[PDB]
Short mmCIF file of C-alpha atoms and ligand atoms in Angstrom, two decimals:
data_model
loop_
_atom_site.label_atom_id
_atom_site.label_comp_id
_atom_site.label_asym_id
_atom_site.label_seq_id
_atom_site.Cartn_x
_atom_site.Cartn_y
_atom_site.Cartn_z
CA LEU A 1 -18.65 -6.61 1.27
CA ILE A 2 -14.87 -5.84 2.30
CA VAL A 3 -11.51 -7.18 1.44
CA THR A 4 -11.24 -10.83 2.76
CA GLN A 5 -7.76 -12.05 2.79
CA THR A 6 -5.38 -11.06 5.16
CA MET A 7 -1.89 -12.19 6.51
CA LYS A 8 -1.71 -14.56 9.41
CA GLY A 9 1.03 -14.25 11.61
CA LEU A 10 2.24 -10.88 10.84
CA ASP A 11 5.26 -9.94 12.12
CA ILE A 12 5.16 -6.14 11.65
CA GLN A 13 9.07 -6.04 12.58
CA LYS A 14 10.27 -8.30 9.63
CA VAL A 15 7.97 -5.95 7.30
CA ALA A 16 10.44 -3.03 8.34
CA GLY A 17 12.81 -1.44 5.56
CA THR A 18 12.69 -0.04 1.88
CA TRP A 19 9.64 -0.80 -0.17
CA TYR A 20 8.70 0.03 -3.92
CA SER A 21 4.97 0.66 -4.97
CA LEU A 22 5.38 -1.80 -8.13
CA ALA A 23 1.62 -1.81 -8.78
CA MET A 24 -1.61 0.16 -7.36
CA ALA A 25 -5.24 -0.79 -8.20
CA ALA A 26 -8.40 1.47 -6.85
CA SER A 27 -11.97 0.52 -7.00
CA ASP A 28 -12.65 4.12 -8.77
CA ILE A 29 -10.34 5.53 -11.58
CA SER A 30 -10.53 8.94 -9.99
CA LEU A 31 -8.61 7.69 -7.11
CA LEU A 32 -5.48 6.75 -9.14
CA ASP A 33 -5.57 8.52 -12.50
CA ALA A 34 -3.55 11.53 -12.11
CA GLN A 35 -0.24 11.93 -10.22
CA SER A 36 -2.12 14.25 -8.03
CA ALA A 37 -4.97 11.80 -6.82
CA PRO A 38 -5.36 11.13 -3.33
CA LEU A 39 -4.60 7.40 -2.75
CA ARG A 40 -1.92 7.55 -5.54
CA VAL A 41 0.65 7.54 -2.51
CA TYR A 42 4.08 5.75 -3.24
CA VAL A 43 5.86 4.21 -0.29
CA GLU A 44 9.45 4.96 0.67
CA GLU A 45 9.69 2.56 4.00
CA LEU A 46 7.64 1.25 6.67
CA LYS A 47 9.01 1.96 10.21
CA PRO A 48 7.23 -0.33 13.06
CA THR A 49 7.52 1.79 15.98
CA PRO A 50 8.29 0.08 19.22
CA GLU A 51 4.83 -1.13 20.55
CA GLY A 52 3.73 -2.65 17.33
CA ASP A 53 2.01 0.37 15.34
CA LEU A 54 3.71 0.95 11.87
CA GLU A 55 4.91 4.39 10.54
CA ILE A 56 4.83 4.80 6.96
CA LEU A 57 6.95 7.54 5.17
CA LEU A 58 5.71 7.62 1.82
CA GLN A 59 5.34 10.02 -1.51
CA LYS A 60 2.52 12.05 -2.67
CA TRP A 61 1.99 14.68 -5.77
CA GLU A 62 0.36 17.66 -3.70
CA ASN A 63 -0.23 20.59 -5.82
CA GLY A 64 3.31 20.73 -7.75
CA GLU A 65 6.07 18.68 -6.16
CA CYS A 66 6.65 15.12 -4.99
CA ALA A 67 6.25 15.72 -1.12
CA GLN A 68 7.62 13.23 1.63
CA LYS A 69 5.21 12.39 3.97
CA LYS A 70 5.03 10.56 7.33
CA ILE A 71 1.99 8.72 8.74
CA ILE A 72 1.32 6.68 11.68
CA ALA A 73 -0.48 3.19 11.18
CA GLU A 74 -1.82 2.21 14.51
CA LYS A 75 -2.09 -1.51 15.40
CA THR A 76 -5.55 -3.32 15.97
CA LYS A 77 -6.61 -6.46 17.69
CA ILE A 78 -5.88 -7.94 14.35
CA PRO A 79 -2.08 -8.36 13.57
CA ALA A 80 -3.03 -7.43 9.77
CA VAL A 81 -5.14 -4.61 10.00
CA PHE A 82 -4.10 -1.25 11.15
CA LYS A 83 -5.56 2.23 11.50
CA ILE A 84 -4.74 5.47 9.87
CA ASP A 85 -5.97 9.04 11.55
CA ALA A 86 -8.79 9.73 11.29
CA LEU A 87 -12.03 11.77 9.95
CA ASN A 88 -13.65 8.49 9.29
CA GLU A 89 -11.38 5.40 9.79
CA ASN A 90 -9.36 4.57 7.03
CA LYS A 91 -8.07 0.94 7.53
CA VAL A 92 -5.05 -0.77 6.25
CA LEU A 93 -4.93 -4.42 6.05
CA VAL A 94 -1.90 -6.52 5.05
CA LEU A 95 -3.08 -9.13 2.77
CA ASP A 96 0.20 -11.07 2.09
CA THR A 97 3.92 -10.89 2.18
CA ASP A 98 7.03 -12.93 2.32
CA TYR A 99 8.92 -9.89 4.35
CA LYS A 100 11.81 -10.38 2.33
CA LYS A 101 10.46 -9.69 -1.38
CA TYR A 102 6.94 -8.43 -1.59
CA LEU A 103 4.07 -7.21 0.34
CA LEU A 104 0.22 -6.68 -0.67
CA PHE A 105 -2.01 -4.19 1.17
CA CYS A 106 -5.15 -2.51 0.72
CA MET A 107 -6.85 0.49 2.26
CA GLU A 108 -10.64 0.88 2.45
CA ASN A 109 -13.16 2.98 4.51
CA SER A 110 -14.79 2.05 7.92
CA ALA A 111 -18.19 3.38 6.30
CA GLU A 112 -17.65 0.69 5.20
CA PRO A 113 -16.57 1.00 2.41
CA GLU A 114 -19.57 0.16 -0.04
CA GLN A 115 -17.38 0.12 -2.17
CA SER A 116 -14.12 2.39 -2.15
CA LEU A 117 -10.82 0.73 -1.76
CA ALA A 118 -7.26 1.32 -2.83
CA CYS A 119 -4.47 -1.61 -2.83
CA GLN A 120 -0.60 -2.01 -3.89
CA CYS A 121 2.16 -4.44 -4.36
CA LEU A 122 5.06 -3.34 -2.45
CA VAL A 123 8.46 -5.00 -3.71
CA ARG A 124 11.76 -4.85 -1.73
CA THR A 125 13.81 -3.90 -5.14
CA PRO A 126 13.22 -1.70 -8.12
CA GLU A 127 12.42 -4.48 -10.32
CA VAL A 128 9.27 -6.31 -12.03
CA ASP A 129 8.69 -9.21 -9.76
CA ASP A 130 6.00 -10.81 -11.86
CA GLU A 131 5.80 -13.87 -9.15
CA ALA A 132 4.25 -10.94 -6.81
CA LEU A 133 2.41 -9.27 -9.54
CA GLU A 134 0.47 -12.81 -10.31
CA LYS A 135 -0.30 -12.82 -6.29
CA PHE A 136 -1.37 -8.88 -6.83
CA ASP A 137 -3.92 -10.01 -9.72
CA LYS A 138 -5.32 -13.17 -7.66
CA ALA A 139 -6.19 -11.09 -4.74
CA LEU A 140 -7.80 -8.44 -6.75
CA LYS A 141 -9.42 -10.93 -8.55
CA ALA A 142 -11.58 -11.21 -5.41
CA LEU A 143 -12.47 -7.44 -5.36
CA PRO A 144 -14.12 -4.50 -7.51
CA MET A 145 -11.27 -2.78 -9.07
CA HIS A 146 -11.52 -0.18 -12.01
CA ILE A 147 -7.98 0.88 -12.50
CA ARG A 148 -4.52 -0.82 -12.24
CA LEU A 149 -1.03 0.90 -12.58
CA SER A 150 2.06 -0.64 -12.53
CA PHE A 151 5.74 0.96 -12.83
CA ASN A 152 9.14 0.02 -14.45
CA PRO A 153 12.73 -0.15 -12.76
CA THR A 154 13.50 3.19 -13.63
CA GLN A 155 9.97 4.88 -12.45
CA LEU A 156 10.80 2.70 -9.26
CA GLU A 157 13.78 4.95 -8.64
CA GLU A 158 12.49 8.59 -9.15
CA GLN A 159 10.39 10.35 -6.24
CA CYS A 160 7.02 9.96 -7.16
CA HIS A 161 7.79 7.71 -10.12
CA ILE A 162 8.73 10.08 -12.91
C1 MYR B 201 1.04 -2.30 5.99
C2 MYR B 201 1.44 -0.85 5.69
C3 MYR B 201 1.29 -0.58 4.24
C4 MYR B 201 1.35 1.14 3.62
C5 MYR B 201 0.18 1.86 4.08
C6 MYR B 201 0.27 3.19 3.68
C7 MYR B 201 -1.04 3.82 3.07
C8 MYR B 201 -1.76 5.08 3.84
C9 MYR B 201 -1.80 6.15 2.95
C10 MYR B 201 -2.99 7.50 3.59
C11 MYR B 201 -3.39 8.27 2.47
C12 MYR B 201 -2.45 9.61 2.85
C13 MYR B 201 -3.24 11.10 1.93
C14 MYR B 201 -4.37 11.46 2.73
O1 MYR B 201 -4.51 11.07 3.79
O2 MYR B 201 -5.08 12.34 2.13
#
């Protein structure tokens, strides 16, 4: 009744650097349909703060404009799962990553989430890496997704992806 798959041995210090949202999938169309939807977030980079926590700088369409956005993902007992401030706990779990080339993550609710959830295939360079997109699918095969987006190299370079 949640997201089952996670990353064991997650060194959140080897995940740091630049990242590109190549694909995103949500359990509901409304979460990802328009540019203004809430979990239509593009990911600039991950900064692992000294003391574990992860800092995301990201891009969203908020009104009219691609706004940069800094967010703080707070480590939990489980290396792969982090927590975002706050209203009702938004948890991020890292499904999979090879650190160097791709990263699979999902965000859901601690309510819990029957059954709302956004996921993303972060990559390092602006390229269609199909061997991570294949991994994105097979980890979404295990889940209730009703929208998948994916982007090109040219949209991977603009802010909010054109
Ligand atoms: C391992 C970390 C992967 C990157 C996680 C970033 C996702 C957090 C986005 C939270 C949504 C921001 C907009 C909002 O709160 O309305």
